Design a protein around this ligand. Sequence first.
Ligand SMILES: CC(=O)N[C@H]1[C@H](OC[C@H]2O[C@H](OP(=O)(O)O)[C@H](NC(C)=O)[C@@H](O)[C@@H]2O)O[C@H](CO)[C@@H](OP(=O)(O)O)[C@@H]1O
Ligand SMILES: [Cl-]
Ligand SMILES: [Cl-]
Lengths: 217, 222
Amino acid sequence: DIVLTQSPASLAVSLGQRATISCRASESVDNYGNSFMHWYQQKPGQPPKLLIYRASNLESGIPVRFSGSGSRTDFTLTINPVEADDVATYYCQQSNEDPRTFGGGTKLEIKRADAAPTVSIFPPSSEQLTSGGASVVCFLNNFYPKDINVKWKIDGSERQNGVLNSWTDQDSKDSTYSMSSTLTLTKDEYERHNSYTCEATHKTSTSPIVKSFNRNE
Amino acid sequence: EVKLVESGGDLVKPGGSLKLSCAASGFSFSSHGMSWVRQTPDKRLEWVALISRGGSYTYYSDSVKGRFTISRDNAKNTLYLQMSGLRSEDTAIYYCTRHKGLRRGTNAMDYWGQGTSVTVSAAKTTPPSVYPLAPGSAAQTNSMVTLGCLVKGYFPEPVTVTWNSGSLSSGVHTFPAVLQSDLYTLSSSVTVPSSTWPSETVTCNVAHPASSTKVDKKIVPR
Ligand SMILES: CC(=O)N[C@H]1[C@H](OC[C@H]2O[C@H](OP(=O)(O)O)[C@H](NC(C)=O)[C@@H](O)[C@@H]2O)O[C@H](CO)[C@@H](OP(=O)(O)O)[C@@H]1O
Ligand SMILES: [Cl-]
Ligand SMILES: [Cl-]
């Protein structure tokens, strides 16, 4: 089958700048005076959306800042200017031969100014406790860049065991990230300590951003 | 309104079979080729099969050829995918898609359904536990308050979470599930004005279609 190779795998671009994304085919996808490479945009929680068909035709409803060019084995999708809601993964796909095939995708990320997270901490719910388990949940909302490091402390000591972290994708309006950090431990273990802290270290500040509670109030 | 509505996604044992359906409305169904495309857990898009407008031409990816059958009933405006000999690699979200109908060659896929989720696994369906996340009892009252709920111990994906049955839509972050001892857990947060809670009700609505679970958990002050 026709192999499609996309590059780069990800691209990070400031608002208003140009993004150029490349798709190369293992063989020509031209026929009948046309080139049969199409481009799709995929945002999280949404199905893919057609942007460009037959290499250069803009799909109705798609903004003119998206354009496609190329021919035979070599194609490009250009976004100019990049806007906040363009955060997505972009795929090329060929239809010149069956079986039809997709590229592996290029993830577009937005570069913007640093932003400190808003942190919230939640003790295990009573309901979970009666069930015999204990999860301490920390939300770190609306921050930038993505790679904040979260650290947990229990009675002042760093704690890594039982910690699981999960990020949303970049927000389509403010271009920030959010994440949850969840410390899961036995009810026994939860009940033999007092202070629980989740700490975000981030170079939007020299001091950590802290949220804590004491199980003994 | 063009609509493509998939149904039939489920958890299936390896070696098993499954039939997906796609109901097409708001356009001339018999005037378009149609395809199934799937999105695997690595988020890759993978073309699965196509069928011509009248159904006399079909074609399959190398991975599914001989195991899957695509078909259509134009009078019913329905597209089908019969799957058999299912394996781990078939676990994906399956999208019904419409081909554009231009002449002079083949066409891009101009409309896509929301998708239906298929999981192939020997593991059993497990319903979630849903826990309300209200601020700690000693918490400080500010102008803003963040609430949440923790959805724990389910299989397979997905669950969907809404707040106040969709009314509370802004200020919601629902995080990707993470595996925990071979079951999934996620949490969702919502931020609203302190004037609105606990004065007015805030509820998280959790659905887990594979186990027919529907839970509405009210967030109450401790
Ligand atoms: C037209 C062509 O050369 N290829 C198209 C292909 O055609 C398959 C098939 O379509 C008709 O049969 P039914 O659909 O079964 O009726 C056609 N009969 C007619 C026109 O009376 C056959 O001659 C023809 O072999 O079908 C696919 C549709 O998916 C086309 O791809 P796109 O949808 O991407 O355009 C392909 O162009
Ligand atoms: Cl593919
Ligand atoms: Cl012509």
